[PDB]
């Protein structure tokens, strides 16, 4: 508050009074009389640098950099090892990236919708959540952040036919329309590779949404970024027939101790 700490009528006692020169409250017979106000060190005093409203709360980002991030986040969902490292019990799932038939969208009832995922293999991931429901470890308990749990699968659809409502109760399961695809959903806690269940229509639409060599973009003047390398692995280049031909002979990886 702007008033907090300034709602006192203190006055400095002056020089040579055999007492500290902090501004003390006037009056008498109350206990509050003859004690320190207007000071960061004082009790009931005004804090150092009162936190103002006009702090930089929101952050401006480049729109292209923001798009790069979501493309990277999508790319990391189809790696399977990156998904396993991120969390997500994806050992018993048929393939990555996981694509389910379009009839998944039409499901109205949660009981049938969870039965679709359990048949697919996301059973273990939905048991990771629900078993990971813990109390918040802080003052977050009494600030409406009482419970905390693990993130489950994303379920990406092209167009809703009752899927958004079907899965909004099963804990951890988030849904996103392909046109959107949130970064905060795709890479939670800035860790790459959420376990993403795609739908058939969504997976085909992803070509249109982002673009490739053949198709355009659908985003105005956007292209997917180029690799500054050819291959994301170095050791095919180094342990080639080529490079190991233009190279001087090898050492021992650990020198024999001369003297």
């Amino acid at each position: 508050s702007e008033k907090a700490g300034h709602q006192t009528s203190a006055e400095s006692w002056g020089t040579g009074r055999a007492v500290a020169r902090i501004p003390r409250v006037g009056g008498g017979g109350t206990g509050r009389s003859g004690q320190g106000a207007f000071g960061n060190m004082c009790r009931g005093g005004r804090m150092f640098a009162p936190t103002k409203t006009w702090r930089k709360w929101n952050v401006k980002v480049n729109h292209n950099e923001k798009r790069y991030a979501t493309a990277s986040a999508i790319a990391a969902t189809a790696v399977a090892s990156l998904v396993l490292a991120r969390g997500h019990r994806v050992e018993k799932i048929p393939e990555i990236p996981l694509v389910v038939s379009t009839d998944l969208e039409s499901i109205q009832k949660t009981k049938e919708a969870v039965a679709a995922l359990k048949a697919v293999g996301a059973h273990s991931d939905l048991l990771k959540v629900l078993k990971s429901k813990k109390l918040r470890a802080g003052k977050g308990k009494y600030r409406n952040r009482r419970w905390t749990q693990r993130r489950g699968p994303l379920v990406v659809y092209a167009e809703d036919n009752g899927i958004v409502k079907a899965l909004r109760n099963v804990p951890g399961v988030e849904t996103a329309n392909v046109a959107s695809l949130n970064l905060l959903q795709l890479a939670p806690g800035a860790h790459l590779g959420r376990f993403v269940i795609w739908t058939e229509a969504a997976f085909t639409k992803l070509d249109q949404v982002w673009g490739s060599e053949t198709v355009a973009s659908s985003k105005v003047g956007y292209t997917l970024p180029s690799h500054i390398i050819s291959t994301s692995d170095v050791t095919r280049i180094i342990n080639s027939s080529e490079i190991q031909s233009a190279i001087r002979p090898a050492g021992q990886a650990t020198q024999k101790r001369t003297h």
Binding site: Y142, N144, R146, R168, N169
Partner: protein
Amino acid sequence: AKQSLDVSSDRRKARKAYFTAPSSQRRVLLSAPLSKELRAQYGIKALPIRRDDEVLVVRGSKKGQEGKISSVYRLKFAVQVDKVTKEKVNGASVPINLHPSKLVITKLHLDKDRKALIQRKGGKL
């Protein structure tokens, strides 16, 4: 999950609303479930509680003990079941404050408005 914008998921607002609830709202907040026999007869899960009806205690130290409600202490969010009493050191008797969620009704006290309450909630007396 919360969908409506009217309802609040705030803890501070919700706890205050409960503790500073009036007697009329506390009547609904002190609801007891019916036993499986009455649920089969009347076709209803739970009702608000009153005086002259019988009850069976499910949870607590007084487990399995039954009786008839003496007085609904709505201020303390409690019922006081007769013959479920803690004997004081002076030989006197003091009733235990039970909560109606822990109780289960075995024999209802049907009045006219009580009959109407059952018929409203999809009942068949």
